[PDB]
């Protein structure tokens, strides 16, 4: 019999040829003599074209490909949580085996147009400026793009990490990057203990770019199984331009013809088939939810470029952080005019909704004035207001490394910037009244707090007035 | 036991076919030795590296030399592994090729020496380390703005004549000097003249005696000239796997080897990606950079120049190079020009170890002035350049005089500038230097020249040139 | 003191129509350039196409 | 033991006859058609070129490939593939020849990286105030067209970069001595033509070259000689006796 | 053919600078269209007055041409086109309009046809 067996004929750059194998699948996985796994991907009238999934150095023209007969799955399940995984799902950290009963293919079809429901929950990723001026609410997928060292990573840590007491699963893939980074993120993510709920997929530069490129399609696929279970899940994909990279090499190893601008054509299909497998399910089909969170990288903050423009197409929504205002030391970067999330809003909460509005126009104000500041003149129209609140609303919107804050003490604080609390105050102390403002608010403010945390509402103005003044009384200007 | 024949010659393309099930395996080595049996012929000593099995017994290699005089039906001899080199205390101090084969006349390798296969997996994700601690050079500029980290990758970006070999020789001039620990150069398409220069320069300076060098001329085939950057790296591999030594890894040019790799690709015959590269680039890249990582035992840093083809940043080669750097410098022909050396653009230069919990808060805040300071100057040169400086600001005035002494100390005088200027070179400790800088943010040296802050060591010389200028 | 004041108001308006001139210039300029370079792009994707075809 | 110097015309003719045979021979192409090799023929041609050692014999030869540009793009294979290769480069520019600017050496773009160990030592003296001087015009003569009212050593810059653009011009066919190469470029950078209006400069110099063979010849041959610059007081007395005589418009 | 010693310095000289004349006003197209023809120097004015000048003069009306348009067309000698294009350089006939050096043959009919034109 050569059924359930074949022999390679061909071995190049990690694509492989065999005879026989009659009763493949496409899409199935195969096995080679040396364990390495491979997906039939082309079956021709004569041979099998089998793409290898792990170092090809070790297979020679004439060994044994052995059928599996399951079409390309995954494990899923929750003895997944807490570990660092291949695409394949083989664990990477070693600490033995990961023990789960479940899996589910890669290639799955999107929720119907009917299984939908509109997005309404709000998602907390505990950074000012997101939370303010770009609401994400779950079951949206927001593309976040900015250059190199924009500190994307850090805000999808942030993020990753204000929902240590949120009931949400979060899913981190990293592709194309150092494992040493991936090993730092790992190290940062269990320091402030987010691996109690936190799946990592990692796929580095050394691995084959079928890895690469089937990385986020495994993730999305552990993502499914909780959220079809009636779950939230938070996918964060960190380059889908290393995976365009990737998905461009294979197709010009399988000698297909280029597309526009050397890409093949099929890239905003492959862009469209990931990014539409996140949905907020109706009732019918439980109360579960996914949202991602795909980067893009530009150049030299070109967004009019193929694939930023694609992934803007696909997605509801973008976060743009620009260089020049890293560089400033505006550490988080938001550009807050052409940052925009269309499906949130609806899902932001009534008490945030009520001083977003005055903030946008306070920032935006500035952000048409900064430029006029070589000479401050015309009274009210430029100075008092325009330069003094925009300056201080940079100073506010600042936010140290890894320390997200609750939605109650940003609507407090940006309440306060907004109700001109911080006019007297000078800039280069507003951190540090808002640190302490932090700190009184904790000793004192517990009904406030526990009044906003349960109505989704601002409390008495009075009364948050009064508390306001009192804790400006003990405030010492330095 | 059984030997291969050739059956076509493409130039630097050779077709073997073997025996069938004895094939050898992908990036294997294959030996071509042949003796002319008649007048008609020429002796041949040559290696092939096994690229593709085109099936049917038959296999595409890439040469590591010349294929002039090959006949079809030559015998090859099969090695069975892929392209050993001589690994272990014997480098140091000679110089090879691309297959370790010295090149300095001094003799050959001892037969029973260990070698190792240059082809080799990755560090896993159990046994990497994540440590951070800075790797102090001497340089001014390189300490104050973008520290380098022991362990990491560091890239300097440039065009023709900035100046990155020159900085690269003073890198390993002072780091052999003031700690004492083993340096590989790989030469990746390095040009003759270059090479010689530079073996002759570390002869004389005695550093020779501690580095291994392996050069891989231009002349070469695009083979050896990929295969040279994976030959140093497994050799420099060695000094931590079994003595877990901390060894620097010097590349002449990125740039360089991945035109190889493209070169290697058309050979090959697969399709062009983007701008005509290979569409393996990112692999290949990524295979050739995850190799440098500190682990358990020790830990390799790597100082890499890489080439800018017309001024474009966007260019993939060196576009792809940026995801693997930790700190990146760039060198400009505008302050190349002016005579400020090492040239080192001070706003462009990035580091991820500019932290204030990594290089202290003092050293963060004086480089974040000094920044602040020099980008403020910037735009002010229009407004100066036409209207008189008289029409700035009472602080203007000051930014301007303390920025000209800022960018004029930034400039250094290296040991190896010897040749060209003929005034010894000197070492700046980073206290030293940040304790300069923060003198001159303050303002207690704006009575002096500023022509005495230009190509100057410590600040103490600073004084020392200006009273000699009669101050 | 009348005249000094037009003056500065004179250069003002200069400078301000100069600017408007120099940005108006700046778009064309980008959107040619732009315009020029995709046309190379789908030169270079044809020759490649063609190339392929030929073997 | 001998000195050569060797020219090799059009680089891009032969890389184009080279992908004329490896096209007809059916060998796959590259960008813009060439071979993959073809960076290997360049190399191994030029690489050929070197500096013999006393063991060898002390001879030596020189390459100056010639290539081609369409519409001044640098960035093209065969332009990339030659500037990886050598030395340095020398960028000639139409902008520059039909401005009266020849040769037209573009001073910005060119580079040479065995400069300052190929010159004499005089030469070397007079050469670094010059890089200065015309690095500082090239910066400054962006805001040229700004008025006239810029500040005064501003002005004073355009006024030594133009009369440095008016020297370094030359006729055709007419080779300069060193020892007079280095003689009007002192006098250049020292200030003695500073007053000497920009149209007359080309008149100065002759004129100043036709002075050095009657008088001066001691400076001719000290420079010749010892390859240093002679003394600075000899010198400028010499300079100073050609201004009295000379007639300036 | 264009070197001194067959053309004649008398020849090249003028050559050369109607060259550079005509360089120097494609550069100052640029400044010119984003401040202004106010803007430029008294030595830029002269040289944009010059230079539209003498492009309109290397304009020629052709026999073959009497097809096309009603005009006979002309034959230059090269004495002729070498001094009409010194003097323009020399500034005599910076008075006269534009339009009035377009399509002829000689210097001396730009003088006719300003004169027809009414000067
Ligand atoms: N809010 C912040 N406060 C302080 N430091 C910050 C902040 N955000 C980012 N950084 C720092 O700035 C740098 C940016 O790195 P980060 O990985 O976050 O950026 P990135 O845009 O994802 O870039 P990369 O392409 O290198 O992955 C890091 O050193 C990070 O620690
Ligand atoms: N610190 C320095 N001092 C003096 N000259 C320098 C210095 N650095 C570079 N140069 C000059 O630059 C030339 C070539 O620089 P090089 O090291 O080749 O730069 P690159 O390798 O980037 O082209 C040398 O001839 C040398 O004279
Ligand atoms: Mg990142
Ligand atoms: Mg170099």
């Given at each position: 019999?050569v059924?359930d067996?074949g022999?390679?004929?061909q071995?190049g750059?990690?694509?492989?040829?065999?005879?026989?194998l009659?009763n493949?699948?496409?899409?199935?996985?195969?096995?080679?003599?040396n364990?390495?796994?491979?997906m039939?991907l082309?079956?021709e009238?004569?041979?099998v074209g089998?793409?290898?999934?792990?170092?090809?150095?070790?297979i020679?023209?004439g060994?044994?490909?052995?059928?599996?007969?399951?079409i390309?799955?995954?494990?899923?399940?929750?003895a997944?949580?807490?570990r660092?995984?291949?695409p394949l799902?083989?664990?990477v950290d070693?600490?033995?085996?990961?023990?789960?009963t479940?899996?589910?293919?890669?290639?799955?079809?999107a929720?119907?147009?009917?299984?939908r429901?509109?997005?309404?929950?709000?998602?907390?990723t505990?950074?000012?400026?997101?939370?303010?001026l770009?609401?994400?609410?779950?079951?949206?997928?927001?593309?976040?793009?900015g250059?190199?060292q924009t500190g994307?990573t850090?805000?999808?840590?942030?993020?990753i990490?204000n929902?240590?007491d949120?009931?949400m699963?979060?899913?981190?893939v990293?592709?194309g990057?150092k494992?040493?980074?991936?090993?730092?993120?790992?190290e940062?993510?269990?320091?402030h203990?987010?691996?109690?709920?936190?799946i990592?997929v990692?796929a580095?530069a050394?691995?084959?770019?079928?890895?690469?490129?089937?990385?986020p399609?495994?993730?999305?696929?552990?993502?499914?199984?909780?959220?079809?279970?009636?779950?939230?899940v938070?996918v964060?994909?960190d380059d889908?331009?290393?995976?365009?990279?990737?998905?461009?090499?294979?197709?010009?190893?399988?000698?297909r013809?280029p597309?526009?601008?050397?890409?093949?054509?099929?890239?905003?299909?492959?862009h469209?088939?990931?990014?539409?497998?996140?949905?907020?399910?109706?009732?019918?089909?439980?109360?579960?939810?996914?949202t991602?969170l795909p980067?893009?990288?530009?150049?030299?903050?070109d967004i009019?470029?193929?694939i930023?423009?694609?992934?803007?197409?696909?997605?509801?929504?973008?976060?743009?952080?620009?260089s020049?205002?890293f560089?400033?030391?505006?550490r988080?970067?938001?550009?807050?005019?052409?940052?925009?999330?269309?499906?949130?809003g609806?899902?932001?909460?009534?008490?945030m909704?009520?001083?977003?509005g005055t903030?946008?126009?306070?920032?935006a104000?500035?952000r048409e004035?900064?430029?006029?500041?070589?000479?401050?003149?015309?009274?009210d129209?430029?100075?008092?207001?325009k330069?003094?609140?925009?300056?201080?609303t940079?100073?506010v919107?600042?936010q140290?490394l890894?320390?997200?804050?609750?939605?109650?003490?940003?609507?407090?604080?940006?309440?306060?910037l907004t109700?001109?609390?911080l006019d007297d105050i000078p800039?280069?102390?507003?951190r540090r009244?808002?640190?302490e403002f932090?700190?009184?608010?904790?000793?004192?403010?517990?009904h406030?707090?526990?009044h906003?945390?349960?109505?989704?509402?601002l409390?008495?103005?009075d009364?948050?007035?009064?508390?306001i003044?009192?804790?400006?009384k003990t405030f010492?200007?330095? | 036991?059984?030997?291969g024949?050739?059956?076509?010659?493409?130039g630097?393309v050779?077709?073997?076919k073997?025996?069938?099930?004895?094939?050898?395996?992908?990036?294997?080595?294959?030996?071509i030795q042949?003796?002319a049996?008649?007048?008609?012929?020429?002796?041949?000593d040559?290696?092939?590296?096994?690229?593709?099995?085109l099936?049917d017994?038959?296999?595409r290699t890439?040469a590591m030399?010349?294929?002039?005089?090959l006949?079809?039906?030559?015998?090859?001899?099969?090695?069975?592994?892929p392209?050993?080199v001589?690994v272990?205390?014997?480098?140091?101090?000679?110089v090879?090729?691309?297959?370790?084969?010295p090149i300095?006349?001094?003799?050959?390798?001892?037969?029973?020496?260990?070698?190792?296969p240059?082809?080799?997996?990755?560090?896993?994700?159990e046994?990497?380390?994540?440590e951070?601690?800075?790797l102090?050079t001497?340089?001014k500029?390189?300490?104050?703005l973008a520290?380098?980290?022991?362990?990491?990758?560091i890239?300097?970006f440039?065009?023709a004549?900035?100046?990155?070999?020159?900085?690269?020789?003073?890198?390993?001039?002072?780091?052999?000097?003031?700690?004492?620990?083993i340096?590989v150069?790989a030469?990746?398409?390095?040009?003759?003249?270059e090479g010689?220069?530079?073996?002759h320069?570390?002869?004389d300076?005695?550093?020779?005696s501690?580095?291994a060098?392996?050069?891989?001329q231009?002349?070469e085939?695009?083979?050896?000239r990929?295969?040279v950057?994976?030959?140093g790296?497994?050799?420099a591999?060695?000094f931590?796997d079994?003595?877990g030594?901390?060894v620097?890894?010097?590349i002449?040019?990125?740039?360089r080897?991945?035109?190889?790799?493209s070169?290697?690709?058309?050979?090959?015959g697969?399709?062009?990606?983007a701008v005509?590269?290979?569409?393996?680039?990112?692999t290949?890249?990524?295979?050739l950079?995850?190799r440098?990582?500190?682990?358990?035992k020790?830990?390799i840093?790597?100082?890499?120049?890489?080439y800018?083809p017309?001024?474009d940043?966007?260019?993939?080669?060196?576009?792809?190079t940026?995801?693997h750097?930790?700190?990146?410098?760039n060198?400009?022909?505008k302050?190349?020009?002016?005579?400020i050396?090492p040239?080192?653009?001070?706003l462009?230069?990035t580091?991820?170890?500019?932290?204030?919990?990594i290089?202290?808060?003092?050293?963060?805040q004086?480089?974040?002035?000094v920044q602040?300071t020099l980008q403020r100057?910037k735009?002010?040169?229009?407004?100066?350049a036409?209207?008189?400086?008289?029409?700035?600001?009472?602080?203007?005035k000051?930014?301007?005089?303390?920025?000209?002494?800022?960018?004029?100390?930034?400039?250094?005088?290296?040991?190896v500038?010897?040749?060209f200027t003929?005034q010894?070179?000197s070492?700046?400790?980073?206290?030293?230097?940040?304790?300069?800088?923060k003198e001159?943010l303050?303002?207690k040296?704006?009575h002096?020249?500023?022509?005495?802050?230009?190509?100057v060591?410590?600040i103490?010389?600073?004084?020392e040139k200006a009273?000699?200028?009669?101050? | 003191?009348?005249?000094?004041?037009?003056?500065?108001?004179?250069?003002?308006?200069?400078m301000?129509?100069?600017?408007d001139?120099?940005?108006?210039?700046?778009?064309?300029?980008?959107?040619?350039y732009?315009?020029?370079?995709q046309?190379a792009?789908?030169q270079?994707?044809?020759?490649?196409?063609?190339?392929?075809?030929?073997?």
């Amino acid at each position: 019999q050569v059924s359930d067996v074949g022999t390679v004929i061909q071995v190049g750059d990690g694509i492989a040829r065999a005879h026989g194998l009659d009763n493949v699948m496409s899409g199935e996985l195969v096995e080679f003599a040396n364990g390495v796994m491979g997906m039939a991907l082309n079956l021709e009238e004569n041979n099998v074209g089998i793409v290898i999934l792990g170092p090809y150095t070790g297979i020679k023209e004439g060994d044994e490909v052995r059928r599996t007969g399951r079409i390309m799955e995954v494990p899923v399940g929750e003895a997944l949580i807490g570990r660092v995984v291949n695409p394949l799902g083989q664990p990477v950290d070693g600490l033995g085996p990961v023990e789960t009963t479940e899996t589910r293919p890669i290639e799955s079809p999107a929720p119907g147009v009917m299984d939908r429901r509109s997005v309404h929950e709000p998602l907390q990723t505990g950074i000012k400026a997101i939370d303010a001026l770009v609401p994400i609410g779950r079951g949206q997928r927001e593309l976040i793009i900015g250059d190199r060292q924009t500190g994307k990573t850090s805000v999808a840590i942030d993020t990753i990490i204000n929902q240590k007491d949120q009931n949400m699963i979060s899913i981190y893939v990293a592709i194309g990057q150092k494992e040493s980074t991936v090993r730092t993120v790992v190290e940062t993510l269990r320091k402030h203990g987010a691996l109690d709920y936190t799946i990592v997929v990692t796929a580095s530069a050394s691995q084959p770019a079928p890895l690469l490129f089937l990385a986020p399609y495994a993730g999305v696929a552990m993502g499914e199984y909780f959220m079809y279970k009636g779950k939230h899940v938070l996918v964060v994909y960190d380059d889908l331009s290393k995976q365009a990279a990737a998905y461009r090499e294979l197709s010009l190893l399988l000698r297909r013809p280029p597309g526009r601008e050397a890409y093949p054509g099929d890239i905003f299909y492959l862009h469209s088939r990931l990014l539409e497998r996140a949905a907020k399910l109706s009732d019918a089909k439980g109360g579960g939810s996914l949202t991602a969170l795909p980067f893009v990288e530009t150049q030299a903050g070109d967004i009019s470029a193929y694939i930023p423009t694609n992934v803007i197409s696909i997605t509801d929504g973008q976060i743009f952080l620009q260089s020049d205002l890293f560089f400033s030391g505006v550490r988080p970067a938001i550009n807050a005019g052409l940052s925009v999330s269309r499906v949130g809003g609806a899902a932001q909460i009534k008490a945030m909704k009520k001083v977003a509005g005055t903030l946008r126009l306070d920032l935006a104000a500035y952000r048409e004035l900064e430029a006029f500041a070589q000479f401050g003149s015309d009274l009210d129209k430029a100075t008092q207001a325009k330069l003094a609140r925009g300056a201080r609303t940079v100073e506010v919107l600042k936010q140290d490394l890894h320390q997200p804050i609750p939605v109650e003490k940003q609507v407090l604080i940006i309440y306060a910037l907004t109700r001109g609390f911080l006019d007297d105050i000078p800039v280069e102390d507003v951190r540090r009244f808002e640190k302490e403002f932090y700190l009184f608010l904790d000793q004192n403010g517990q009904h406030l707090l526990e009044h906003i945390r349960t109505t989704k509402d601002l409390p008495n103005e009075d009364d948050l007035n009064k508390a306001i003044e009192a804790f400006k009384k003990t405030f010492v200007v330095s | 036991m059984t030997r291969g024949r050739v059956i076509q010659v493409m130039g630097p393309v050779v077709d073997v076919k073997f025996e069938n099930g004895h094939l050898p395996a992908i990036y294997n080595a294959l030996k071509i030795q042949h003796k002319a049996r008649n007048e008609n012929e020429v002796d041949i000593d040559l290696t092939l590296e096994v690229a593709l099995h085109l099936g049917d017994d038959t296999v595409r290699t890439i040469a590591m030399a010349s294929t002039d005089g090959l006949i079809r039906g030559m015998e090859v001899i099969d090695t069975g592994a892929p392209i050993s080199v001589p690994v272990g205390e014997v480098t140091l101090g000679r110089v090879f090729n691309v297959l370790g084969e010295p090149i300095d006349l001094e003799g050959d390798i001892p037969a029973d020496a260990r070698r190792d296969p240059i082809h080799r997996p990755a560090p896993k994700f159990e046994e990497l380390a994540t440590e951070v601690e800075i790797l102090e050079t001497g340089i001014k500029v390189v300490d104050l703005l973008a520290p380098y980290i022991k362990g990491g990758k560091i890239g300097l970006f440039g065009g023709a004549g900035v100046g990155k070999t020159v900085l690269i020789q003073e890198l390993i001039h002072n780091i052999a000097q003031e700690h004492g620990g083993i340096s590989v150069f790989a030469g990746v398409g390095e040009r003759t003249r270059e090479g010689n220069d530079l073996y002759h320069e570390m002869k004389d300076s005695g550093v020779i005696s501690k580095t291994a060098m392996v050069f891989g001329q231009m002349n070469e085939p695009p083979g050896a000239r990929m295969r040279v950057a994976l030959t140093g790296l497994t050799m420099a591999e060695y000094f931590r796997d079994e003595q877990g030594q901390d060894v620097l890894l010097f590349i002449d040019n990125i740039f360089r080897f991945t035109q190889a790799g493209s070169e290697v690709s058309a050979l090959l015959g697969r399709m062009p990606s983007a701008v005509g590269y290979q569409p393996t680039l990112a692999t290949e890249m990524g295979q050739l950079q995850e190799r440098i990582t500190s682990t358990a035992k020790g830990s390799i840093t790597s100082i890499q120049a890489i080439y800018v083809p017309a001024d474009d940043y966007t260019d993939p080669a060196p576009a792809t190079t940026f995801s693997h750097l930790d700190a990146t410098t760039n060198l400009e022909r505008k302050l190349a020009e002016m005579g400020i050396y090492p040239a080192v653009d001070p706003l462009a230069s990035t580091s991820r170890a500019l932290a204030p919990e990594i290089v202290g808060e003092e050293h963060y805040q004086v480089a974040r002035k000094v920044q602040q300071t020099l980008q403020r100057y910037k735009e002010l040169q229009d407004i100066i350049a036409i209207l008189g400086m008289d029409e700035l600001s009472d602080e203007d005035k000051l930014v301007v005089h303390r920025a000209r002494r800022i960018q004029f100390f930034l400039s250094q005088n290296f040991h190896v500038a010897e040749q060209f200027t003929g005034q010894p070179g000197s070492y700046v400790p980073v206290k030293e230097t940040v304790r300069g800088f923060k003198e001159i943010l303050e303002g207690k040296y704006d009575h002096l020249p500023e022509d005495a802050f230009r190509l100057v060591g410590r600040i103490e010389e600073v004084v020392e040139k200006a009273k000699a200028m009669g101050v | 003191l009348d005249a000094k004041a037009s003056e500065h108001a004179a250069r003002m308006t200069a400078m301000k129509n100069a600017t408007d001139n120099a940005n108006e210039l700046i778009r064309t300029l980008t959107l040619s350039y732009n315009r020029a370079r995709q046309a190379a792009i789908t030169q270079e994707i044809t020759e490649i196409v063609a190339g392929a075809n030929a073997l």
